[PDB]
Amino acid sequence: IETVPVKLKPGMDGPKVKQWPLTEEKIKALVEICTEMEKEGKISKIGPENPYNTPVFAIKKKDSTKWRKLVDFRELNKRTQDFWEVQLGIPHPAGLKQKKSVTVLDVGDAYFSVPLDKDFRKYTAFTIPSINNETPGIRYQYNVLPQGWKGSPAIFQSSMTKILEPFRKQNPDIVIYQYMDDLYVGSDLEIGQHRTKIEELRQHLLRWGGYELHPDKWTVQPIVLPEKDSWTVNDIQKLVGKLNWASQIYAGIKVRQLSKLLRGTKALTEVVPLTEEAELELAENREILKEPVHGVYYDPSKDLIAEIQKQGQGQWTYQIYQEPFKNLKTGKYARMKGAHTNDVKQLTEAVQKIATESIVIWGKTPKFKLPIQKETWEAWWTEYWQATWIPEWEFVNTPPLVKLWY
Amino acid sequence: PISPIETVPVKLKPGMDGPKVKQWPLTEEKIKALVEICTEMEKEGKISKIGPENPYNTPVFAIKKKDSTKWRKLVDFRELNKRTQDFWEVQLGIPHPAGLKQKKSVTVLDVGDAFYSVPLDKDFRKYTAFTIPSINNETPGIRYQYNVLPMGWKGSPAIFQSSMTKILEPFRKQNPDIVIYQYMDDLYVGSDLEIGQHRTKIEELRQHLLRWGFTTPDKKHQKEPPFLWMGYELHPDKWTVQPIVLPEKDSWTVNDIQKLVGKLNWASQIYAGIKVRQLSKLLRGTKALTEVVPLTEEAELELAENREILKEPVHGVYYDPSKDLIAEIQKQGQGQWTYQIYQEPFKNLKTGKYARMKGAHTNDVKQLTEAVQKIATESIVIWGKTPKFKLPIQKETWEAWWTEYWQATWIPEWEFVNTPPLVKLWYQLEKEPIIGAETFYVDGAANRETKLGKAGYVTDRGRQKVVPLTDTTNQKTELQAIHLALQDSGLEVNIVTDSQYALGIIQAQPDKSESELVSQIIEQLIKKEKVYLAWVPAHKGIGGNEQVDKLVS
DNA sequence: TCGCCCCCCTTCGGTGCTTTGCACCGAAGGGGGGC
Ligand SMILES: N#C[C@]1(COP(=O)(O)OP(=O)(O)OP(=O)(O)O)/C(=C\F)[C@@H](n2cnc3c(=O)[nH]c(N)nc32)C[C@@H]1O
Numbered sequence: 004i005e006t007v008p009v010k011l012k013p014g015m016d017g018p019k020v021k022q023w024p025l026t027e028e029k030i031k032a033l034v035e036i037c038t039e040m041e042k043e044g045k046i047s048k049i050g051p052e053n054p055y056n057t058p059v060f061a062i063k064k065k066d067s068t069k070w071r072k073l074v075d076f077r078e079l080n081k082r083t084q085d086f087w088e089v090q091l092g093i094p095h096p097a098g099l100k101q102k103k104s105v106t107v108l109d110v111g112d113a114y115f116s117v118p119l120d121k122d123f124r125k126y127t128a129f130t131i132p133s134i135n136n137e138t139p140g141i142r143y144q145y146n147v148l149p150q151g152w153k154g155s156p157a158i159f160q161s162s163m164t165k166i167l168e169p170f171r172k173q174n175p176d177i178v179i180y181q182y183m184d185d186l187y188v189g190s191d192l193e194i195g196q197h198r199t200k201i202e203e204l205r206q207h208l209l210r211w212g213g214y215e216l217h218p219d220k221w222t223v224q225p226i227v228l229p230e231k232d233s234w235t236v237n238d239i240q241k242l243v244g245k246l247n248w249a250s251q252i253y254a255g256i257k258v259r260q261l262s263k264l265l266r267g268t269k270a271l272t273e274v275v276p277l278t279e280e281a282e283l284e285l286a287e288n289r290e291i292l293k294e295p296v297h298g299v300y301y302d303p304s305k306d307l308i309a310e311i312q313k314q315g316q317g318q319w320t321y322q323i324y325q326e327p328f329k330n331l332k333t334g335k336y337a338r339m340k341g342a343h344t345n346d347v348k349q350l351t352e353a354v355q356k357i358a359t360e361s362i363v364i365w366g367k368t369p370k371f372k373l374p375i376q377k378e379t380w381e382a383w384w385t386e387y388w389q390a391t392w393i394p395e396w397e398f399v400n401t402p403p404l405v406k407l408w409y
Numbered sequence: 410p411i412s413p414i415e416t417v418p419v420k421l422k423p424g425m426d427g428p429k430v431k432q433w434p435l436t437e438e439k440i441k442a443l444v445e446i447c448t449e450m451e452k453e454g455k456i457s458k459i460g461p462e463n464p465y466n467t468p469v470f471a472i473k474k475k476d477s478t479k480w481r482k483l484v485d486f487r488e489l490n491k492r493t494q495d496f497w498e499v500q501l502g503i504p505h506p507a508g509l510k511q512k513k514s515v516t517v518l519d520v521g522d523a524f525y526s527v528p529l530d531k532d533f534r535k536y537t538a539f540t541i542p543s544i545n546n547e548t549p550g551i552r553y554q555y556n557v558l559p560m561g562w563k564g565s566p567a568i569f570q571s572s573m574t575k576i577l578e579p580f581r582k583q584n585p586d587i588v589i590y591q592y593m594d595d596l597y598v599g600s601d602l603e604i605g606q607h608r609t610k611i612e613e614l615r616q617h618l619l620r621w622g623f624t625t626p627d628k629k630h631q632k633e634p635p636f637l638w639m640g641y642e643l644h645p646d647k648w649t650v651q652p653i654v655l656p657e658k659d660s661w662t663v664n665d666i667q668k669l670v671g672k673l674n675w676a677s678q679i680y681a682g683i684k685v686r687q688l689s690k691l692l693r694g695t696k697a698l699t700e701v702v703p704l705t706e707e708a709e710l711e712l713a714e715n716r717e718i719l720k721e722p723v724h725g726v727y728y729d730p731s732k733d734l735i736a737e738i739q740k741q742g743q744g745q746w747t748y749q750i751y752q753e754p755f756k757n758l759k760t761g762k763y764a765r766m767k768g769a770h771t772n773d774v775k776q777l778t779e780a781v782q783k784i785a786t787e788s789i790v791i792w793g794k795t796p797k798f799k800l801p802i803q804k805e806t807w808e809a810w811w812t813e814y815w816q817a818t819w820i821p822e823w824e825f826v827n828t829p830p831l832v833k834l835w836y837q838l839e840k841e842p843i844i845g846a847e848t849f850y851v852d853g854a855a856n857r858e859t860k861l862g863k864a865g866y867v868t869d870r871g872r873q874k875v876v877p878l879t880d881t882t883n884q885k886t887e888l889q890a891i892h893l894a895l896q897d898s899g900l901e902v903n904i905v906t907d908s909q910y911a912l913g914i915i916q917a918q919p920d921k922s923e924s925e926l927v928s929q930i931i932e933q934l935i936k937k938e939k940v941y942l943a944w945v946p947a948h949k950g951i952g953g954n955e956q957v958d959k960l961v962s
Numbered sequence: 963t964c965g966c967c968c969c970c971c972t973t974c975g976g977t978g979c980t981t982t983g984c985a986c987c988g989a990a991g992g993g994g995g996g997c
């Protein structure tokens with residue numbers, strides 16, 4: 004087959020990211036995986052004259068107890084030419100986020116049948132480490148379209164369209180969306196019925212080469228004001244400061260007469276009664292915060308941003324936006340392991356869940372602002388990652404000015 | 410000999426040409442020395458004479474070798490290195506003896522003239538040109554180029570390492586039950602074979618290396634313990650570091666203290682309890698490597714402690730994969746931590762220390778978490794797994810920390826060990842305001858252009874105070890205002906500020922800070938019985954906040 | 963008068979914040995050690 008000519012964006016060089024340490028289990032898995040792919044010509048052993056590198060690690064699901072190799076091509080994807088500019092990219096269907104159930108299938112293996120522009124392969128180098136540095140690193144570069152590279156779905160585009168062509172007309176009410184190495188496929192059947200059609204697709208795919216999502220249970224959680232009969236100065240101070248922040252989001256919110264109530268240098272535990280003029284103010288502000296904000300629409304040409312806050316006892320609130328204070332979506336994630344002991348595992352799971360919802364809804368992941376120290380996140384996150392994609396993220400230390408979302 | 414291994418193709422950076430640099434110490438002794446070295450190298454085909462059509466040049470020199478009676482040759486390729494292409498280095502770390510498993514039979518060998526046994530790519534040789542002068546400049550001079558990896562070139566280590574890996578891989582695949590540690594030209598070979606058979610595999614390995622052009626001189630062939638390896642001594646049951654000699658001076662310069670700290674850090678991998686914080690302090694605010702620095706009293710005590718630690722003999726043991734790894738941390742004070750990693754009690758695999766201050770404001774629980782993360786990473790590098798931890802922090806303390814701290818945090822499976830001083834939270838902010846406690850509405854403002862500010866408060870019981878501040882910032886004024894409330898209040902206090910900044914610092918329960926102002930606030934928070942710290946938005950006429958707002962003008 | 967790697971401690975300068983200094987972070991200086 005002919006290679007598609009691919010290029011890095013003007014004035015950019017390939018990734019030069021160091022490999023991080025990996026456990027024994029993952030090194031062994033990466034070597035058995037890479038030894039075979041070398042044998043099948045999918046990758047070639049290289050040396051140090053290739054100046055590029057990208058971290059590699061491995062993930063194992065508990066519904067799929069085999070190791071899956073994962074190359075963190077985030078830096079390479081950033082520096083790769085856009086394929087929307089070349090009109091090879093994938094359009095997102097607005098229909099998926101409505102469906103009863105959405106299953107995710109890893110079709111990254113399909114990319115291994117199409118060669119990569121030989122002049123671009125050097126940018127795909129990665130290095131397997133060794134326990135106790137018994138040996139130098141062993142380096143490989145791809146010869147095929149790599150899993151995790153954003154150009155692979157774009158180049159395989161018109162091929163995937165042919166593979167799914169029959170399944171699509173035979174099932175016109177199922178919607179398929181390809182994102183990276185994944186197929187997001189949703190329908191409105193009974194779970195049993197739906198699953199069945201999935202195995203059909205699987206076996207059709209299998210001829211050539213996790214768990215059910217449910218979009219309609221992704222309830223938005225809004226900004227709710229407490230309900231009390233007696234209000235202390237402090238209770239009102241928190242309420243005023245909470246509605247004051249919200250005035251940057253919502254419109255026509257007032258503190259004129261709740262702020263009046265704090266008149267004087269009062270003790271924080273003193274119970275101030277509530278005027279009609281201020282009781283009107285609150286119940287007015289309550290409704291404004293009940294049903295969502297008018298004037299916020301998705302822009303596909305801007306980045307998606309996600310902010311997460313730890314609320315304790317297993318709860319995590321999150322907001323997705325493009326312009327600050329114009330949230331496309333607010334939510335609240337909740338844990339699942341039966342011990343409620345591990346914050347980093349919960350945050351890692353929350354990030355995958357939020358990112359999955361963005362793919363389902365908008366077709367791309369957000370850039371995460373993670374409420375965690377960089378070095379704590381990097382010490383543990385790979386142990387809980389289960390997705391074939393990895394979103395962008397940055398690390399924030401923002402104390403809760405108010406418990407806005409709780 | 411020169412390996413028949415295929416060359417590694419190398420390039421210069423795009424747009425750049427080769428070096429062109431003239432020659433130094435044109436002495437006669439040196440010239441004759443240089444023609445003597447080069448003629449033997451030339452006879453073995455390591456270098457070749459070149460003429461004036463090659464425009465490039467680089468200068469030459471040579472230093473001594475640790476193995477006495479050998480000189481080492483070096484060419485100053487600083488310029489060529491700048492123009493040579495980048496390499497991805499495949500040496501990802503340093504093997505450690507604690508990662509070794511006990512072996513029945515062990516051998517340590519080394520390759521002779523390692524770099525000079527690897528050919529250099531044909532097209533790149535002309536850039537390694539160096540002229541040898543002529544009689545202190547009388548005539549044009551003798552030129553050579555390298556045909557092999559030169560010492561001093563940026564690409565030589567990586568290209569050798571890669572070449573050695575290719576050469577050993579046939580032997581590795583064939584003998585998986587032979588552990589080979591490959592560090593540059595140094596090979597450690599361990600096995601559970603009986604000595605007679607082990608030796609068969611050795612000369613089988615040596616003969617394989619020689620087919621590919623790698624000699625293994627008897628001189629560097631270690632057949633008997635103790636083995637000298639990577640700066641350690643390998644015994645059958647244990648390992649030592651080669652002796653570490655610290656400088657002893659009457660008058661210390663900055664540079665000697667730098668040397669001292671470096672030795673102590675190297676020693677801390679097996680010598681438990683090493684501290685360098687007071688010795689490193691001396692290095693701060695200094696401005697010359699030759700600057701004489703008088704040791705503080707604290708630095709003398711720390712060195713004395715370290716010297717007594719180093720006087721006693723210690724050894725590490727080897728790794729048993731059938732037993733768990735255990736990591737025990739102790740707190741040493743002033744942000745210093747020391748740890749031991751072991752599998753059976755009182756038999757350390759290695760030790761170490763953590764003493765970095767991350768952030769301007771932190772506490773012992775955060776630093777403990779960072780120590781655990783450092784140890785966790787080290788254990789992955791050496792043993793491929795993390796250890797079980799024994800930590801001097803109570804479960805109540807940790808659980809209080811991660812329920813009241815807003816950032817996700819975590820520590821693996823750990824077991825409380827009672828080795829005082831324990832790691833504790835030194836104060837906890839009340840989640841709710843305190844009945845009966847005085848309420849302080851604090852605020853402080855500084856004029857960005859002026860340098861002048863005020864800090865003060867107004868209270869529900871009727872007290873007021875303003876302090877003028879000079880040479881301050883706006884964030885300082887707000888910390889100063891909280892400082893006054895804590896100073897003039899009783900054991901229980903409610904405080905209202907409009908500084909998200911100050912609230913952010915304090916709500917993280919720091920117990921140490923680079924700021925002396927924050928340090929003072931911490932000392933006060935620890936003396937208090939109950940503190941509630943609430944925030945409000947400024948300039949929105951809140952009762953109290955507006956009162957003190959108006960006053961601090 | 964040289965090369966490559968890991969570690970620690972200090973300093974410096976770039977980044978972003980609904981900032982005006984501040985906190986964070988990575989790179990570079992010194993030292994240790996390896997070959
Ligand atoms: N490979 C290899 C060797 C082995 O160095 P090593 O002590 O083992 O000696 P050797 O192999 O040259 O020969 P020998 O073993 O004595 O018979 C090296 C590292 F491992 C390289 N190298 C060592 N030190 C230095 C050094 O300071 N400056 C530079 N620029 N390069 C060095 C060159 C040498 O080739």
Ligand SMILES: [Mg+2]
Nearest residue numbers: 520521522594
């Ligand atoms: Mg040698």
